[PDB]
Every structure is written in structure tokens, then in C-alpha cells.
Design an enzyme around this catalytic site. Sequence first.
Site, PDB file in Angstrom:
ATOM      1  N   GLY B   8       0.831  -1.223   0.000  1.00 19.42           N
ATOM      2  CA  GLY B   8       0.000   0.000   0.000  1.00 19.42           C
ATOM      3  C   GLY B   8       0.849   1.250   0.000  1.00 19.42           C
ATOM      4  O   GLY B   8       1.766   1.390   0.829  1.00 19.42           O
ATOM      5  N   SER B  11      -1.087   7.122   2.706  1.00 19.27           N
ATOM      6  CA  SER B  11      -0.481   7.836   3.836  1.00 19.27           C
ATOM      7  C   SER B  11       0.265   6.934   4.795  1.00 19.27           C
ATOM      8  O   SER B  11       1.420   7.170   5.130  1.00 19.27           O
ATOM      9  CB  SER B  11      -1.611   8.473   4.640  1.00 19.27           C
ATOM     10  OG  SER B  11      -2.179   9.462   3.799  1.00 19.27           O
ATOM     11  N   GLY B  13       1.169   3.686   4.470  1.00 13.32           N
ATOM     12  CA  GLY B  13       2.266   2.981   3.813  1.00 13.32           C
ATOM     13  C   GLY B  13       3.530   3.798   3.669  1.00 13.32           C
ATOM     14  O   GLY B  13       4.624   3.334   3.984  1.00 13.32           O
ATOM     15  N   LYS B 180     -10.462   0.879  19.322  1.00 18.22           N
ATOM     16  CA  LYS B 180     -10.425   1.939  18.311  1.00 18.22           C
ATOM     17  C   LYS B 180     -11.734   1.905  17.494  1.00 18.22           C
ATOM     18  O   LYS B 180     -12.262   2.941  17.109  1.00 18.22           O
ATOM     19  CB  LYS B 180      -9.203   1.735  17.410  1.00 18.22           C
ATOM     20  CG  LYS B 180      -9.085   2.731  16.221  1.00 18.22           C
ATOM     21  CD  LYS B 180      -7.723   2.597  15.498  1.00 18.22           C
ATOM     22  CE  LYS B 180      -7.835   3.032  14.032  1.00 18.22           C
ATOM     23  NZ  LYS B 180      -8.549   4.341  13.917  1.00 18.22           N
ATOM     24  N   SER B 247     -12.947  11.215   8.582  1.00 13.87           N
ATOM     25  CA  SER B 247     -12.557  10.625   7.302  1.00 13.87           C
ATOM     26  C   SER B 247     -13.735  10.129   6.455  1.00 13.87           C
ATOM     27  O   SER B 247     -13.650  10.094   5.222  1.00 13.87           O
ATOM     28  CB  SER B 247     -11.625   9.451   7.542  1.00 13.87           C
ATOM     29  OG  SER B 247     -12.288   8.435   8.278  1.00 13.87           O
TER      30      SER B 247
END
Lengths: 291, 292
Positions: B8, B11, B13, B180, B247
Site C-alpha cells: 500500500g 499515507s 504505507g 479503536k 474521514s
Amino acid sequence: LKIGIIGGGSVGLLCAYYLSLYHDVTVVTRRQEQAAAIQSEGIRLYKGGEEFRADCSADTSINSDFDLLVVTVKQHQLQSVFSSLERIGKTNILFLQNGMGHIHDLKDWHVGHSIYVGIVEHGAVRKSDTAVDHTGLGAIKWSAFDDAEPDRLNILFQHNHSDFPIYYETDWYRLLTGKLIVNACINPLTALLQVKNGELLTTPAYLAFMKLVFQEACRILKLENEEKAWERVQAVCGQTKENRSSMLVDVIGGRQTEADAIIGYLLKEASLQGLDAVHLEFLYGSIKALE
Amino acid sequence: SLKIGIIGGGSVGLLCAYYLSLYHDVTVVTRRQEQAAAIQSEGIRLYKGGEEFRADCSADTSINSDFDLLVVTVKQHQLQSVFSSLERIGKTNILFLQNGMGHIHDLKDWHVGHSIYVGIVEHGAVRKSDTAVDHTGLGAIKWSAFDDAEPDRLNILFQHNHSDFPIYYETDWYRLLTGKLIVNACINPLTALLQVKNGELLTTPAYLAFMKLVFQEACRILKLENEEKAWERVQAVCGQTKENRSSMLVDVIGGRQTEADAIIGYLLKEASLQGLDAVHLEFLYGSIKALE
């Protein structure tokens, strides 16, 4: 008899066509350009493949003694109309606005007019300043407000075209809330979920959410028979099961909605009775965002 | 040195590739050859509050080495192709750093000889270009063994890290991830529908009450140890991010696929397996999905 239709939108033009079959009609509009056009061409109604034309007067203000004034403007335009109506001699006024947002305003509009309220179950689309398409063959139902006498409108509405039937009901509050409870439970959900009315019944989770909304709104509106009303909401849902609701339709097409007129009304009444309206407020916030 | 592949080039990665490159041989495995070419070309740049660093890194569009560790950072939607590659390579260590818990259902019934680890990323990181990342939030990575993986396997790999890239082992993978998830599930779908900043959830009485209703469902589905504490936290994190757009709100505004399946879709599958109701979660899921 002289009838004035206030508003030259889709509902105003539909009413103008059908009532002009029986009465002298004048469309009272805010645009000189519309008035002139109706004055020149009358009103064109389309129905299925077919077109018909009614002779109709128009004007940008009220200059005759009308036996009835039918108010078809949106909430944005209502306060200016009250002011105009305050400047004329006592007559009969029928408000046909969708939802019940205007009702707070009506309760404390103190004038000498005889006030009537109604609901429009027809489907109509305005095509131009003079033209309207009768897309859904429905009805109008009306009732007296604040003790006005129904017999003032009986002669006017005695005879109508079979595609414009007009029904009287004794209880205006039952009339308006019976329609409001349905629209409140169905329209917001289909707009956010983007499903047909029927999927609200067939997805257990969606039905359960509509029940939460119902339970809030039924309490706010102080409906007489909760269980009967809930049956009706689900029954009206099953009957319109293939329809994309009006608000869903407004939604895919980025048109402003009846969120204020429908849900906004419930929110104001919930606040006044100190009632909880969590689900209604979430739906209100979510639909206002899409606008 | 040891070889790490970062799967990936988003961001997270790029952030991991920069910092792990300080100690190890890193390749970023990107789906687009143009990114792979560009990394192999001017390296990775990391911006951190006025400083800019450069690290040289390898890149590829396929996993075609035997890495000592693979770190999986891709969105759920591309996870499926990753799994398919992960079958044609030798057994190794794989660390999944995916948002949400939808991958947890995929991993549960995964017959492989791989050692599986799972973790969360608490850094703030924003991809600026194909080769550049801004380290906006100095956080940490926390990881756990999944199933029967041996934690010590990552000891040498994670023995030494940059001060600003700390990495912490936690013994309970399920507590780590759900801790989370409860937060994301309560804030993200709601903000996406209402289109308000996070703080608006706390300061609007009905929105807070609606969040609580969502919390109660999610909390039960996940069987969270301390409920009162988790609720405080949700409101706490809302407070910390008051001016932020979540997000998911951003994804919805942008017409991009969201992480609804990985966040909410996992809770829905779990509610169903337990005969639990999740009416608010289901309505949120249907409405966000309708937008896609």
C-alpha cells in the site's frame, strides 16, 4: 362566483384549470410576466397524451371581491400573502400547503376571514408560466379551521370534474395529521436509504427504525389511536410500495425538500411539549445536509 | 539487512516505509506502476513540522520477494487481491494495519502458514503526492499476535525505532482493535450523514443522544469490558477532534468509497451472529451505502 388562486406554481395552475370548468378564476401571481402570459393564453393542462385549455384571468395583486381565495404558495412566500390578505374585505380562504409548517402561523393569524385548510393528493408538474401536467390523478380534501362554516365552500365545490374530486372532512386536525404522520415516517427514510416505499416494510431493520420515528411523531402529534395509526402508516406504505417517495425524488435531482414543512413542524412541537425527538432531529439534520 | 514489504502506498504505507527504511530494507508494493517508478526514483519524502527528510526505498507492483515482514496498509476493498498474492509466497510474518475490523472475519478462517499480527496506527499522516507524506500527528503503532502467532518473531524487526515512530506490543488483539473501532463507529457514520464537524456531535443534544444509541448497540455487539469508560472516551475523542471533519464525512463529500463495510458492516455481521439488534447501525450503513 369568483375564485382567486394565490400562487402560479404547479398546484395553483392545476386548481385554476379544473375550477375554471365551473367558476370565474383569476390567478394571482408575483410575476407580471406570468400574469400577462395567462391573460393572453389562459391555462394549458396536459393529462396523459392530451392537452386542454381553460380561460383564466390573472393579476399581480387582488383587485376583485373573490368568493374564495385558494392559497398554494410555499412557506417562503406565506408571510407576504398574509399581509396582502389583511388588506382586503372579509372572505373565504383555503390554504393547501403541504405539511403543517404553516399551521403555527395560522393559529395566531387573527383576521376576520373564514379560514379553511386542505391537502392536495394530486400529482402535478408545472411546464411553463401557463402550463401544467396532471401527472397523478388524486383528490383534494378540506376542512373548516377555527370554527369557519363549511357551507361557505359547499356550493363552490358541489360539482367537479371526475379527475378533480373534492371531499370535505369534519376534523381539520385529524385531516392534516393523518397525512403528516405518513409523510414523516416514509419520506425521510426513503430519501436517505434511497429505496422504494416497499423496502421499508420488507427489511426488518428499516421497519423497526420507521417505528421509532412513528412513536416519536405519534406522541408529538397527540394522535388518538396509536396502534391504528401505525397500521395505517404501514398500510399506506404497502399501497405505495413501488413508489420512490416525493422527498427521495427531490433528493436524486438536488431539489430542496419538504423537510422544514414536515419534520421541522414536528421538531417545533416536540420542543414546546418538551418531547424527545432524537430520530426526527437526526433525519432533519441528514436531509438538511443534502440540500 | 532484514527485508520489509509495505503493501500500500497511501499515507500510512509511505509513513511506515520512511521510518522502517531507517533500520531495514524496504519495498513499497503499490498497485500503480507510476507510483512504484516514482518512489524507486526520488525516494520517499517525509515532512515533519518544518523538517523534510528523504529516504531511498524500493518499490514494486507485486509481491515478488520473500520478505521478513509484510505490513498491510491498503483499504478493505483492495484487501481481496492482497490475500490472493499472500497465498503464492513463502510463509512469513504479516502485520495488518487496516482500519476497521472487516478483515478480522477474513483472517478468522484463513488457512495459511503465515504468522499473523494485527495492529492500529495512532499517527496522523497525510499523503502529499506519490512519493511524499506529512507526519502530522506524532503517535505510535500498537500491535498484537493474532491467533497463535509468536510475538517474539517481531523482536529483532522492532528492536530499534526512530523516536517519533514508536512501536508497542499489546497482549490482547481484540481489546486493542475494538477499542479503536467503538470510537470510529460512533463518530464517522454520524458525521457523514449530518455533515458536521466532530464537535457538533457533542454540543447538539439530539446528536449526542443519537450517538449514545449507536454506542449502546456497538458496545453490546463487541462485548466491551468497561462500557462507561468506553462512552467517556468516545466523547473525549470527539472533544479532541472538535474542528475536524471525520474521514468518512470526507469520503462521502468526495464521492469516494467509504470504510462503511470495514467499520459498520463488521458490527452488522456480528450483531446477526449473536441475534442482536442493530437498527441504528443498519440505518446508517444503508444510508452511507446508498451514496456509493
